[PDB]
């Protein structure tokens, strides 16, 4: 439901082929807030509840809604946080593909994690979806050093981060018709596209 630790839970000896890291929204609960549920659930549907480790950034990403304001979107401590969970799967699984997502402050989190990735990591990352992404205007709908065509961007009109503002206005709470249908596709679709472990 909203905390999943798969990847920090998981045995080595029985790696998932698919492992899933996402970055929950500000003030949102657990380490996988309102939207990371329905997307874990549909990608269990796809790879089976053993082929899929789904990983929600907990530990020092405390989702503060202050931290938005920061340089790069989010807090140092969490953009720290996020590369050791994808150190840590890159250690544990050395095979296995893996996947991303944020949400509104942790759309910027996953952004900043994924541009300051060692190379070799940020190129096991098969898809990244991004909702509400707050430096979309910025950044110009890309992630920093990583393919357009691995990135999805779901960004409503009238969510007025996506237009380089930090008001939250309602488009930024409809991302749910997102996270339960397009954004799960996209992701199963990149992982096929490569296959799995």
Same mark, same amino acid.
């Given at each position: 439901?909203?905390?999943?630790?798969?990847?920090?839970?998981?045995?080595?000896?029985?790696?998932?082929?698919?492992?899933?890291?996402?970055?929950?929204?500000?003030?949102?609960?657990?380490?996988?807030?309102?939207?990371?549920?329905?997307?874990?659930?549909?990608?269990?549907?796809?790879?089976?509840?053993?082929?899929?480790?789904?990983?929600?950034?907990?530990?020092?990403?405390?989702?503060?809604?202050?931290?938005?304001?920061?340089?790069?979107?989010?807090?140092?401590?969490?953009?720290?946080?996020?590369?050791?969970?994808?150190?840590?799967?890159?250690?544990? !699984?050395?095979?296995?593909? &893996?996947?991303?997502? +944020?949400?509104?402050?942790? =759309? $910027?989190?996953?952004? #900043?994690?994924?541009? %300051?990735?060692?190379?070799?990591?940020?190129?096991?990352?098969?898809?990244?979806?991004?909702?509400?992404?707050?430096?979309?205007?910025?950044?110009?709908?890309?992630?920093?050093?990583?393919?357009?065509?691995?990135?999805?961007?779901? !960004?409503?009109?009238?969510? &007025?981060?996506?237009? +380089?503002?930090?008001?939250? =206005? $309602?488009?930024?709470? #409809?991302?749910?018709? %997102?996270?339960?249908?397009?954004?799960?596709?996209?992701?199963?679709?990149?992982?096929?596209?490569?296959?799995?472990?």
């Amino acid at each position: 439901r909203t905390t999943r630790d798969d990847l920090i839970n998981g045995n080595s000896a029985s790696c998932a082929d698919v492992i899933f890291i996402y970055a929950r929204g500000s003030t949102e609960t657990g380490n996988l807030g309102t939207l990371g549920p329905s997307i874990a659930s549909n990608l269990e549907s796809a790879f089976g509840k053993d082929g899929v480790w789904i990983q929600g950034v907990g530990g020092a990403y405390r989702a503060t809604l202050g931290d938005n304001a920061l340089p790069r979107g989010t807090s140092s401590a969490a953009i720290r946080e996020m590369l050791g969970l994808f150190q840590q799967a890159n250690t544990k !699984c050395p095979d296995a593909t &893996l996947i991303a997502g +944020g949400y509104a402050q942790g =759309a $910027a989190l996953a952004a #900043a994690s994924i541009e %300051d990735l060692d190379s070799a990591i940020r190129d096991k990352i098969a898809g990244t979806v991004l909702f509400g992404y707050t430096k979309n205007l910025q950044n110009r709908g890309r992630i920093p050093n990583y393919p357009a065509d691995r990135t999805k961007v779901f !960004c409503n009109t009238g969510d &007025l981060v996506c237009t +380089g503002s930090l008001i939250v =206005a $309602a488009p930024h709470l #409809a991302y749910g018709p %997102d996270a339960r249908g397009p954004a799960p596709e996209f992701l199963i679709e990149k992982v096929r596209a490569v296959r799995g472990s």
